[PDB]
Ligand binder design. Sequence first.
Ligand code: CU
Length: 128
Amino acid sequence: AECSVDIQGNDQMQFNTNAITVDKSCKQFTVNLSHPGNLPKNVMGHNFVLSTAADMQGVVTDGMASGLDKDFLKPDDSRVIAQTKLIGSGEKDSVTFDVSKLKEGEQFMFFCTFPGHSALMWGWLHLK
Ligand SMILES: [Cu+2]
């Protein structure tokens, strides 16, 4: 009945959750990302990117290669189920995606693609 979650990425290169479950009665699900803390996005930006477990490491790698100007994401990446923009201190962004896009019994990964951040900024997302 709650079709959204609030997640934070801070100056310690952590998300404030590592697990998100989505009610299977939701048609859409919304992730609202914010960045408390004081560092600007060119040194400690975060985004929220959702993919299969299989695609995560590729998306992270090609994101790094894409650079800060493209928010550390490859443009038109068919592996990305959903993504926010890259944000810095005091900013927020949100993304809404269709729940039909998630398969029952499959666990998806969410992560940040800012270089190195996926060391700690990763999590699971699945229906339930
Ligand atoms: Cu980050």
